[PDB]
Amino acid sequence: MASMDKVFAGYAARQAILESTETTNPFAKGIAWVEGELVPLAEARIPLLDQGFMHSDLTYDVPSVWDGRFFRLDDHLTRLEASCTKLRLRLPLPRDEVKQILVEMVAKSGIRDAFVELIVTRGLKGVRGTRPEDIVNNLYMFVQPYVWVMEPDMQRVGGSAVVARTVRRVPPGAIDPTVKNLQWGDLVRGMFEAADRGATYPFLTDGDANLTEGSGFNIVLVKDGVLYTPDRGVLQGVTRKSVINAAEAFGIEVRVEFVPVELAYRCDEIFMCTTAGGIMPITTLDGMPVNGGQIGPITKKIWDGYWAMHYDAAYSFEIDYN
Amino acid sequence: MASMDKVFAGYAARQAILESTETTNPFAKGIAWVEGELVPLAEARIPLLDQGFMHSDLTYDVPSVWDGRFFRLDDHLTRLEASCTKLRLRLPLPRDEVKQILVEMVAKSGIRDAFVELIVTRGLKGVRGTRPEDIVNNLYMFVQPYVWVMEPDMQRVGGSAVVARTVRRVPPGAIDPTVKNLQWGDLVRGMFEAADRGATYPFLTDGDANLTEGSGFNIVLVKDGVLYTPDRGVLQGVTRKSVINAAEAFGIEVRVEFVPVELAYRCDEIFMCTTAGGIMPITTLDGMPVNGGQIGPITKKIWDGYWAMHYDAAYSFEIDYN
């Protein structure tokens, strides 16, 4: 309320000052690490033959900086190592070293509110016809201005979603959704359907009449004081994990379990959650209002708890910009 | 077969001559087209912010050159265009132009036995939060020495497969498999499974007890004089099409339909088919001989028919290397 005004006014203020440095500082529009080299993001180039491109044989993770403060970086670094493990990849540098390069990269950019991406690929030699010991994994890392999956102004009113019906989410026994990946075939078909049906956001089923996740976000339904989020079929979001921390402190029950589609049509409130946007209310579903079409009271306490946590020492730390 | 001798000895002869040119000709190991430029393949670099990298937002296709003759290039071009249409991409150049460039690229490398790849991506601006008319699709093309999914000498004995049980193929209502794509998370999982179980080649199910395809190839079963190949849930291969043309010429019935997993344990012969290898016999399945472990008579007739077609003007044209 006054909390949204404080978050978005501070952002816009910080953005004006970062825009001013675009003249003097060539990393102010983003910075990339490639084969040990720092370059502007618009000029970064990867080998054609990298298997991240050739066969999307990669995982990634995406921490964030708000107001000069890394949010939950170590959760994102732990998830990345665990993602690596499951695809028989290994992070090419020590994690302590990766964390320091990240802090360096944020600081030379001068970006106070940032999207940060780490990519670990199979490398220049592919799986099909190579002995596993000859395989050298490659790292890429980049910082860019914070990205909004829902713009701050649509967050005040709420977006429109559809439950997708031309597409369903890739099932875990084909590709494990707990391994962050860029195989977005289903998600792109869903974004197109959403647009075709006069909406923005797709909600994908598992094909078995339950909900999973959308094109870059988790889903959370609210119903008689209780939050419900799918357990299975979905990426275990660090924004979803924050939702859960905030709820446990406000004494609100969170249920991570199978969530049937039908529950989305008789819930009190709906919101989406991601690092690239935060807490993102849905007020219209399949062309119809969500329980009056207003942004719900619990959605709003979750919203405020989440941004408060960006200033809490347990979840964040201050970067030194020189 | 003197036919296998013919083909693999002609290959080896032309290879020895291509390898000689490697110190005079910097395109002899591969050539790539990037933003209008021709460059050695090992030096080809693509923008990191390409959505082909960022979210595998792409289709591709892979025609062949054998003994200086393009093999069914017009079929692969018509399929690339069908593929682009279904993803709402557009081939960034006319197809007549793309054809001349490819021919120039093969003639400059001096490669007679070539793997040729075309990749159409979404471009530098992602689908999410960009107006459709501002999206500018990118092309990458490259030529390299012929790739063998199964080596010549293993084609003389046959290879080992497993019906996969840790992974199943991405279903068509998540990603359309008629759309050639590089989202190989399921296929890579399969290559690991197969290897962990002392085999080379994975056969993926649909999760509904039918066969689909494997990590870079279609599957074809022979049973009492009849070929059986899956219709649904697979790429519609140009090799498979050739197999089919050769079967009808020889009076052999081909059934393109649902093929149950059971049929693979009670058939007379098995073979895989792809542009990168040709006709590839399987003689051990789940660690047991297939119908006695010998390469079978219809596999052999199909093998020869397929390489005959490379010198037939209905299916191929001679390049001028100049």
Ligand SMILES: Cc1ncc(COP(=O)(O)O)c(C=O)c1O
């Ligand atoms: C498919 C998908 N699901 C869920 C999420 C939520 O992830 P997190 O809360 O860790 O940012 C993302 C992140 O962008 C995503 O891409």
Ligand SMILES: Cc1ncc(COP(=O)(O)O)c(C=O)c1O
């Ligand atoms: C998954 C998959 N199926 C089938 C094929 C066979 O395609 P084609 O016969 O046109 O090469 C390929 C080609 O590499 C493939 O990747």
